[PDB]
Design a protein around this ligand. Structure first.
Ligand SMILES: CC(C)C[C@H](NC(=O)[C@@H](O)[C@H](N)Cc1ccccc1)C(=O)O
Ligand SMILES: [Cl-]
Ligand SMILES: [Cl-]
Ligand SMILES: [Cl-]
Ligand SMILES: [Cl-]
Ligand SMILES: [Zn+2]
Length: 625
């Protein structure tokens, strides 16, 4: 019942074809996937075999085509018998197609492929005994978006979802994105809800665990175990129950968290039954846990209901950001939800302003070919433009109460399936017959296919106003007060006593933006007011300078750089050797290079090999390499 230009862009058949896979997934049904693996720290390889139970769907070739990337494929059997196969030469950026002749007799058949990972594997990071805080080797995966094919041969598309079983042999503890079949050096798991390959998660190392709720356990290195338990144990069950009330019962069983090694490059990864989390989430006060509301919301938007291709990634991340903000809003109130959206708005702006090819990459729905790296399309746009389209819909349809019935209908309809934007729109229209005119007033063309910032909503700015006022006040007084004594008369620790970490982050951000009002048009620099910038750090030492929150600490370093306080460059350099999260590492190196390149390249050369392959790659070229 949707509008014409949408009708016009929609394919004749949904879900829309995924151009990022070399597999012939439309030709088969994947009924079950079993992983039988062995982890070798000695060789830094995972080897073994994957077994698929498949069903031919109906001049057939007839061939199986699977995705691989830098795998060593060793043998292939169908129904117990050796099957002819050939790997095609690599084509970037999608990899090496594996081609299998299936002379199998029946429509239903079993496919077994023996393989091992290689040194060029893009799915894993390996750490040796000397690299981990705790003294033993460690490995973990990160498969999103198309790295699963570098871990095992598969139909590597989010259109394909399958139950899994897994046996993993390792000389150290293993966690997996499934429920453990309980107790050895052989870890068995089951994932009884069908999942896409990109959600598979594995880690192995010196892991211990501790309960953080009635259905939640945290896993991490022993030295950090109790800190992690304290950080999560007061809040995780509350988050789950909050999400369940907004949507419906959580059906995955356990909700566990793996707090990864310091080289971990993302904030989190929503592997089912084992969220992967950055240790920089641990602040010792519980400031950063919304990253957990985020991964938790994925249980519904992403895991249960999945985007069919990377062109429609907004369905995953936009919904998740929307749901995440509903959780925090339900717990903390609307001003908190709106504050989070306000920070997200400025993240969106920066992302689009910093963009290479904004005309292409800032549209909500993407158009990747088979020549486009799906990475190249990941930005803040699917998150925040996605969120803003949903927030707009919430509003015009009558508010949370009117929208929540749709949310439940949507996640129920597509549970365990994959979909495209067009199917999302059909569902929206089928659900609101009485509201057809309101939905037809939505400029679907601008929201879905046009580049740039969408129309700006009217967020409640209550929790940011105090922050903006102070940053403005600091910008002004920097040009008026001279001696530190002067500053202490105007400012004191009292003025940020009520600032949470998000507010501190926004404050320090606004300062490098030199205020949130054009009183001083010129982007003058803090470098020329050392007494003020030094007084800042002094007066606010308790809450900013002494903070154990990596988010605030990072901003503190950045303010220090924007103010070119040279005596602090050393602490930035060394701190950067302590974290691996891209969000801090990449910008950190950009910051340090703009004030001391001889130190930035010296620092990188020192820590380069401690970072995740991805983070090392991007920092390498950030530093002109
Ligand atoms: C949005 C933030 C709360 C956290 C953010 N993480 C996510 O959105 C995760 O759920 C994503 N799985 C991170 C991701 C997406 C696409 C490709 C690679 C990695 C991150 O930066 O890690
Ligand atoms: Cl229709
Ligand atoms: Cl239209
Ligand atoms: Cl085999
Ligand atoms: Cl209606
Ligand atoms: Zn996410």
């Amino acid at each position: 019942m949707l509008p014409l230009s949408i009708e016009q862009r929609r394919p004749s058949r949904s879900p829309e074809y995924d151009q990022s896979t070399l597999s012939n997934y439309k030709d088969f049904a994947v009924l079950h996937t079993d992983l039988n693996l062995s982890v070798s720290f000695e060789k830094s390889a995972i080897s073994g075999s994957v077994t698929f139970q498949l069903k031919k769907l109906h001049n057939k070739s007839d061939e199986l085509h699977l995705d691989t990337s830098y795998l060593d494929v060793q043998e292939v059997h169908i129904d117990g018998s050796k099957a002819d196969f050939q790997i095609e030469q690599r084509k970037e950026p999608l990899g090496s197609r594996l081609v299998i002749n299936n002379a199998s007799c029946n429509d239903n058949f079993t496919l077994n492929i023996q393989f091992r990972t290689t040194d060029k594997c893009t799915a894993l990071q390996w750490l040796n005994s000397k690299q981990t805080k705790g003294g033993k080797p460690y490995v973990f995966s990160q498969l999103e978006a198309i790295h699963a094919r570098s871990l095992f041969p598969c139909f590597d598309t989010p259109s394909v979802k399958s139950t899994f079983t897994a046996s993993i042999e390792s000389p150290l503890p293993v966690v997996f994105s499934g429920i453990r079949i309980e107790d050895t050096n052989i870890y068995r798991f089951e994932q009884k809800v069908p999942i896409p390959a990109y959600l598979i998660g594995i880690a192995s190392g010196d892991l211990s665990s501790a309960p953080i709720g009635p259905r939640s356990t945290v896993y991490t290195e022993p030295f950090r175990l109790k800190d992690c338990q304290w950080e999560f144990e007061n809040d995780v069950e509350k988050f789950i129950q909050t999400a369940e009330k907004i949507i419906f019962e959580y059906e995955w069983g356990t909700y566990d968290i793996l707090v990864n090694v310091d080289s971990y490059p993302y904030g989190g990864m929503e592997s089912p039954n084992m969220t992967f989390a950055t240790p920089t989430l641990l602040a010792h006060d519980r400031s950063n846990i919304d990253v957990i509301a985020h991964e938790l919301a994925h249980s519904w938007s992403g895991n249960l209901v999945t985007n069919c291709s990377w062109n429609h990634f907004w369905l995953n991340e936009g919904w998740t950001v929307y749901l995440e903000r509903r959780i925090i809003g339900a717990i903390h109130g609307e001003p908190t939800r709106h504050f989070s959206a306000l920070i997200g708005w400025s993240d969106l702006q920066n992302s689009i302003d910093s963009m290479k090819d904004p005309e292409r990459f800032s549209t909500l729905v993407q158009n990747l070919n088979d020549n486009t790296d799906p990475d190249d399309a990941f930005s803040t746009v699917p998150y925040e433009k996605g969120f803003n389209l949903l927030f707009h819909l919430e509003t015009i349809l009558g508010g949370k109460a009117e929208f929540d019935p749709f949310i439940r209908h949507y996640f129920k309809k597509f549970a365990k399936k994959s979909l495209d934007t067009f199917q999302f729109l059909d569902t929206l229209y089928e659900f609101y017959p009485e509201k057809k005119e309101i939905l037809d007033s939505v400029d679907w063309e601008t929201w879905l296919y046009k580049p740039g910032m969408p129309p700006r909503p009217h967020f409640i700015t209550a929790l940011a106003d105090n922050v903006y006022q102070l940053a403005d006040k600091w910008v002004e007084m920097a040009q008026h007060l001279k001696t530190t004594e002067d500053f202490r008369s105007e400012f004191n620790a009292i003025d940020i006593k009520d600032f949470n970490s998000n507010q501190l982050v926004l404050f320090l951000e606004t300062l490098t933006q030199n205020g949130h009002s054009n009183k001083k048009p010129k982007d003058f620099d803090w470098a020329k007011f050392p007494v003020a910038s030094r007084a800042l750090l002094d007066i606010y030492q308790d809450n900013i300078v002494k903070s154990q929150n990596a988010e605030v600490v990072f901003k503190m370093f950045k303010f220090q750089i924007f103010a070119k306080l040279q005596e602090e460059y050393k602490h930035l350099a060394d701190w950067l050797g302590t974290v691996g999260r891209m969000k801090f590492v990449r910008p950190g190196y950009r910051l340090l290079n703009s004030v001391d390149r001889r130190l930035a390249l010296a620092t990188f050369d020192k820590f380069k090999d401690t970072y995740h392959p991805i983070c090392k790659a991007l920092v390498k070229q950030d530093l002109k390499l």
